[PDB]
Design a protein around this ligand. Structure first.
Ligand SMILES: Nc1ncnc2c1ncn2[C@@H]1O[C@H](CO)[C@@H](NC(=O)[C@@H](N)CO)[C@H]1O
Ligand SMILES: Nc1ncnc2c1ncn2[C@@H]1O[C@H](CO)[C@@H](NC(=O)[C@@H](N)CO)[C@H]1O
Lengths: 147, 143
């Protein structure tokens, strides 16, 4: 999994065309969204992640939480972004992992937002530009799955 | 080299603290800048690129210019973005390579901008959201 962390003043998105023949169904309310004073987590689910989906999600929740604490962000935005990697995991698995992370983050008590999976989206972001406002993490499975 | 191309309505940046002890010297005018209707090329130069700087540069110039043609973008902005890779090249080489890519695009007749190298920078961007508005490319030399 590849993760690009951007501490921003805001993040806005607007769903455009479907990128997958059949993407995650959503309502009018989800077409667009906006968060402020937020740590934006652009995430690319890689093939390897298919090995131990649960392991990776936990790892990412941990890594993402740590940066949030460091930069002191109470808001985190999970953003499906399939361009941080060129070895992508299949959609079904990707959407699942992305959901766990999101869920795991709310479990940590952060205010969390997200963009819908499987669409091309327009977006506007404003990175603060501090030493810690731009970070990356590569998280891969290191254990066998048990299911 | 890891390249992330974002066709945008605009791009804005403002140089903040230094990220290197010896960053690209700049003036006040360069401290900040803005381009509109532009293909932004976020680039992280990798250690492997060090093997053949010229080669990587050429391929990047052809890939970028190609996507520039596809989205009909006349403006291109070269934006140093280390965090696209975890195996970054030596600064001196990254700098030279970025300049090669800058000049190479400039040569093709595009209006090219280039953000300063070696600093932490705040920025604002607006991605159009079209099918080809977000693309990535990995470009390494032929070993
Ligand atoms: N491995 C993966 N990691 C993260 N996201 C993935 C994915 N595979 C599919 N997607 C989702 O499908 C859209 C088109 O690939 C993806 N959309 C995007 O990456 C938008 N930024 C395009 O504008 C995303 O919603
Ligand atoms: N291999 C490399 N590829 C691209 N850029 C590189 C580099 N090595 C050094 N830099 C420059 O130094 C700043 C801190 O690493 C980098 N700054 C940045 O990546 C900003 N986006 C931080 O806000 C960049 O200017």
């Amino acid at each position: 999994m590849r993760v690009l962390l951007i501490h921003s003043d805001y993040i806005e998105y607007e769903v455009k065309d479907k990128a997958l023949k059949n993407p995650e169904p959503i309502s009018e309310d989800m077409k667009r969204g906006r968060m402020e004073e937020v740590l934006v987590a652009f995430i690319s689910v890689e093939k390897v992640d298919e090995k131990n989906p649960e392991e990776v999600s936990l790892k990412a929740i941990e890594e993402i939480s740590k940066v949030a604490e460091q930069v002191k962000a109470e808001n985190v935005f999970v953003y499906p972004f399939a361009h941080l990697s060129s070895e992508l995991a299949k959609p079904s698995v990707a959407m699942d992992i992305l959901n766990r992370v999101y869920q795991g983050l709310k479990e940590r008590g952060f205010n969390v937002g997200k963009a819908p999976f499987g669409y091309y989206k327009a977006f506007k972001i404003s990175c603060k530009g501090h030493p810690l406002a731009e970070l990356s993490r590569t998280i891969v499975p290191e254990e066998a799955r048990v299911e």
